[PDB]
Structure 1
């Protein structure tokens, strides 16, 4: 078929890469009624890693991230969800400071020197963030990124879902949206079947199932799914007013926090290598069950919280960043799932055996900032127009390294070994 006549199913279309793909199909002139978004949960999916009050907009010298940054500034659908507060990337101790100097030097060497400034003392840091405590940031240096800030993530995906609804995109959710298998005819994918038995037929299928991708089809451990954690504190209107338009504050050895949302709520994250949840599971294409990391979904198990070890790290972030708030209860604790490749690059490729089935995953914990742009690259993959360098960087690559460690400091620990999260 031609493009007005091409049917495409986006599996995981309630999440980050999937909603972006559906948007870029519509914007590229695919007929909205020929696009079907399938998700386990209605857009924005309650288990999407993008279903979050906030994410950091930390675009670097990377072409895709920079193209995304421009859309967060200029695109009429997205721009209202980007808060250009700036970002403090803070470092403490001999090794982290040396790595921050080098990151700074690299950004100068890459021609972003005008967007960033080196803060060489605590006085320089308190100038940009006077709500910090001088005592707790003794010896800290920072890169202040003027271009940075934070993204109203769940609101941005919701806004894509409302736009797609109004265009006449087709939806299937719950049993009617939860992918079970591809429909294959002589090695060609011609649609999908969901858990309730519903079949959808299309010319092309995109698997944008995030941390669920390696659970749904055999990916030969090129993606390993891991959880990260957050909790919330509630500020009085007077407390929240002191933090209005605060930059994002990050320290790789502490974690990070955001300015309060419109309800006075501050989200706090630690910084760590993520948690697996290994269990026996048989993805489509696997000859028998395998021990793989299967997300433990907060949407399916809303009584779940986070490990005790995670609460302690978040309390330490609050004690370091916001000592006056050590007494506030930490609430709406949740695990948030991503999938790492060995090299931390995306997995955006045609399936090597199932023609017209495409992977769009490998988010590796840092892809929410790509929400505006990433579906453009997926449409280019479907159309055969993706740049060779990106076709290689995002290629099918089992056996290319250990995704349990990936490019992080250590192999992820497992939730089986981390008490405090399960309240069943």
Structure 2
């Protein structure tokens, strides 16, 4: 500790988002001086364009130690526990293949120690016992895994609760032109701070880039991360319709989509499941020699007249017709795109930059990292301090050329928004 923890200054770029807010939290909890920690975001915490700024996210149960460590904190941490809604989760499958995959997943969870809280549902009867709001006609031939531990996360409220703690402790903040990263400040091969769009300079000993889907746009990542959009929309229930779904399990079918119990206002959110969309644009990230075609997020917060593609509407209507056939005439409203960045292998990118000393990447969220909100900052702090477990250091390493992130671990290469009509309502 060249400076000690107490004397180390750290800038967290994207500190209004999932990984960034977690990092700031763990710096303060670890004993960094709060006023030595600066959170920079394009938008105030919880950032309007953060993938974590939503009513709800699912808690994926999986045979993953990092996810397990996060799940413990969602159950027990004084800050996080109140934002976890343990309603259970139903993972459903149909066809003689998706069912084979689900059976292998089930066996994997049992092998890893989850036998007491995971159940195999081998028939329509068994599915309807766990989710009686479904309709037999729509689930013919389905099988499911029920995860008793499992549920949904009040995502924006969790990030806001972090923001309140950081403010109360004395963390420094910069937003808008004073928070929008433009470039690292480098000197003699070392990163010694950040410059924002408006020309404000911040000097620090270490800088973390936790800019989510914006990370490959801000600095040269050699296509390790490719940014893609997922879609959702909303339906409004009457008070009596809503009461039928109170504390109901999350339902997911990889072939269809997923949905959540209604919020306090009777609104259900419905998501597609698909390989995501790029939005290619010429852009020159810091460190690129010239402009290049990269997927650049089309931010709903900056372009609030945007919706989602016509093809996404078709798929979400199909999700509603399957899960919720009695609500098929309800309008789908507040349609929006949300952005994530995929790696080729779907693992995180948590590493020091190989040339810019003291600049650290904390991205590659790969569409499945909101569940890690409580724990991920601990790993980032351990990276800064040189104490991250070897296995995780290897898994999350700098790895350009390690495969094609446009397809990643998904079913197909993502299609581009330029080719998908229906979302753009600009002049």
Does the aligned pair in 2 maintain the 1:49–1:336 contact within 8 Å? yes
Which moves more between the two structures, 274-283 or 51-60?
A: 51-60
Pick one of 169, 174, 181 that aligns with 2:176: 174
Long gaps (5+) in structure 1: none
For these two proteins, the number of residue pairs brought into alignment is: 424
Note the C-alpha offset of 1:107: 1.1
TM-score (norm 1): 1.00
- 1:347-383, CA deviations, whole angstroms, 9 ceiling, x for partnerless residues? 0000000000000000000000000000000000000
Query: Secondary structure at 2:186's aligned position in 1?
Result: strand
Pick from 19, 24, 27: which aligns with 2:26?
Answer: 24
2:106 aligns with 104
In 2, Cα distance between equivalents of 1:69 and 1:378: 18
Shift in Å, 1:286? 0.3
Task: Report how far residue 114 of structure 1 moved.
Answer: 1.1
**Alpha-carbon distance in 1 for matches of 2:262, 2:184:** 43
Residue 162 of structure 1 and its aligned partner are, at CA, apart by 0.8
Q: Distance in 2 between matches of 1:34 and 1:263?
A: 40
Could you tell me how far apart the structure 1 residues matched to 2:340 and 2:228 are?
6
Extract unaligned runs of 5+ from structure 2: none
Residues 13-32 of structure 1: CA distance to partner in whole angstroms, max 9, x if unpaired? 00000000000000000011
Distance in structure 2 (CA, Å) of the matches to 1:287 and 1:49: 30
- The superposition leaves residues 105-160 of structure 1 with CA deviations (integer Å, 9 ceiling, x where unpaired) of 11112111111000011110111111111100111010000110000101110111
Match of 1:331 among 311, 330, 333: 333
Q: Secondary structure at the match of 2:407?
A: coil
Decide which moves more: 15-24 or 106-115.
106-115
Deviation larger for 84-93 or 106-115? 106-115
- Give the counterpart of 2:353 among 351, 361, 381: 351
Residue 327 of structure 1: how far off its partner (Å)? 1.1
Q: Give the Cα–Cα distance (whole angstroms) in 2 for the partners of residues 93 and 289 of structure 1.
A: 45
Residues in 2 aligned to 1:2 and 1:74: alpha-carbon distance in whole angstroms: 30
**Do the aligned partners of 1:59 and 1:369 also contact (CA within 8 Å) in 2?**
no
In 2, the alpha carbon distance for the partners of 1:74 and 1:50 equals 21
Q: Distance in 2 between matches of 1:108 and 1:43?
A: 39
Give the Cα–Cα distance (whole angstroms) in 2 for the partners of residues 280 and 362 of structure 1. 21
- Residue 59 (structure 1) shift: 2.8
Structure-2-length-normalised TM-score: 0.99
Mean CA deviation greater in 48-57 or 102-111: 102-111
Q: Deviations 1:257-279 (Å, cap 9, x if unpaired)?
A: 00001111100001000000011
SS across alignment from 1:4? helix
SS at match of 1:292: strand
Q: In structure 1, what is the Cα distance between the partners aligned to 2:320 and 2:387? A: 47
Higher alpha-carbon deviation: 109-118 or 88-97: 109-118
Q: In the alignment, is the contact (CA less than 8 A) between 1:255 and 1:268 conserved in 2? A: yes
